[PDB]
């Protein structure tokens, strides 16, 4: 099997800057017939892959002029003139000259964008889930940048750190921001004893914390 | 273009047959190749078949573990995997590279454990918490096996102001969430619903997010 190795592993770019992805094969990809069977594919997460360039430099229909395929023999390069919001995802170099076809490890591309503060939203457990024995208090932290952030859950003043389940979404392809969900799963008995529930979020955009809460009593 | 079968919780030791069906075109004129993607690693080429004469080739790692066949009649290609184990729990795609046709993917979980359907809970906001002229609502889909789940707002009508968070596994059961921010005017006037389809157990669930009252 022929090894395809690409660099870098990740790549940050300010919307507008160029970018380059390199790929190196353990063997030449020039077939005896004069053809180099190498391609570059893109994949934005949880979607079917898409081919950008094939045969090293030919571009597929409906692929912007800014995607250039270069290289020969064992070294090939993928170049993006100006990087845009929609370019976020993973890129791979794929060889089909030797059998079996092998794909490189892929390269994830991220975008450096201006900083943003998350718009917070807290949610009390649906009664529908209450009458089943449990209680999920969810908090949504949306459209913010950079990725790094943290969330504390405070019940009646005291901080809790278990039951918590967090999820981050990939960098949005429209505004390059993020979002994150944080839910605190507890029993209904535990839930009904306590009144005040809080969701504290601290983000680079401010040292002072974004505080969203609700008092299970008046609603 | 290319429709593929749904997710399948099949048990260890078993076999499985995946179908890929072409519509807009005729699969004779193309080579149908299948690629594996263990959603951690990259793509792994499995093999390919020339449906016109059912002529195929398989990667060394798949000889004897994969079988490719085609049905020129119903415009369908198949990839039958045998002796499934934990190494096969992946997402397989069928593809016709010539003109770049892909199928949405078929998730496959090899596990002994049984299928569980998710419980969908609408998330409507506390006492009119009003952040401006917008309203943010959610849908908590939890307790299901296996992946994936397919969530949409109003069968897809709500194509913006949506955030569908990756599912996190916990105690051998997944959990997922989604949000939707809209203008203060629409909801509650115009109703909102999140459809959750757990194809692994032929389950479709629509939840009308209604304004809470005495609770």
């Amino acid at each position: 099997d022929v090894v395809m190795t690409q660099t870098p592993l990740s790549l940050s770019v300010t919307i507008g800057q160029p970018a380059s992805i390199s790929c190196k094969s353990s063997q030449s990809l020039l077939d005896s017939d004069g053809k180099t069977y190498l391609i570059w594919v893109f994949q934005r997460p949880g979607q079917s892959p898409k081919r950008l360039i094939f045969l090293v430099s030919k571009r597929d229909s409906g692929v912007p002029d800014r995607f250039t395929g270069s290289g020969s023999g064992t070294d090939f390069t993928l170049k993006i003139s100006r990087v845009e919001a929609e370019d976020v995802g993973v890129y791979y170099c794929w060889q089909g000259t030797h059998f079996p076809h092998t794909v490189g490890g892929g390269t994830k591309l991220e975008i450096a964008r201006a900083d943003a503060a998350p718009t917070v939203s807290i949610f009390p457990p649906s009664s529908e889930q209450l009458t089943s024995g449990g209680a999920s208090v969810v908090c949504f932290l949306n459209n913010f940048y950079p990725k790094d952030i943290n969330v504390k859950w405070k019940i009646d003043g005291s901080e809790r750190q278990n039951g918590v389940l967090n999820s981050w979404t990939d960098q949005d392809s429209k505004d390059s921001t993020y979002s994150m969900s944080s839910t605190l799963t507890l029993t209904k008995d535990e839930y009904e004893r306590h009144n005040s529930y809080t969701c504290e979020a601290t983000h680079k955009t401010s040292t002072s914390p974004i505080v969203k809460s609700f008092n299970r009593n008046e609603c | 273009k290319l429709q593929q079968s749904g997710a399948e919780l099949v048990r260890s030791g078993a076999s499985v047959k995946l179908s890929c069906t072409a519509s807009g075109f005729n699969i004779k004129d193309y080579y149908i190749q299948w690629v594996k993607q263990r959603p951690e690693q990259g793509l792994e080429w499995i093999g390919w078949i020339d449906p016109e004469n059912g002529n195929s080739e398989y990667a060394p790692r798949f000889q004897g573990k994969a079988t490719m066949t085609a049905d020129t009649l119903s415009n369908t290609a198949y990839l039958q995997l045998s002796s499934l184990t934990s190494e096969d729990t992946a997402v397989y795609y069928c593809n016709a590279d010539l003109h770049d046709y892909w199928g949405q993917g078929t998730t496959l979980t090899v596990s002994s454990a049984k299928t569980t359907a998710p419980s969908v809970y609408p998330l409507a906001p506390v006492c009119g918490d009003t952040t401006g002229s917008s309203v943010t609502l959610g849908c908590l889909v939890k307790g299901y096996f296996p992946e994936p789940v397919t969530l949409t707002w109003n069968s897809g009508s709500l194509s913006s102001g949506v955030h569908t968070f990756p599912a996190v596994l916990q105690s051998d059961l997944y959990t997922l969430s989604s949000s939707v921010t809209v203008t203060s005017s629409t909801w509650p006037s115009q109703s909102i619903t999140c459809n959750v389809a757990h194809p692994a157990s032929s389950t479709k669930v629509d939840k009308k997010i209604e304004p809470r009252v005495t609770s």
């Binding site: 069977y37 089909g96 | 080579y31």
Partner: peptide, 10 residues
């Protein structure tokens, strides 16, 4: 054929 953009079947 041509049925692919990669190397054809032998």
């Amino acid at each position: 054929a041509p049925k692919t953009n990669m190397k054809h079947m032998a």
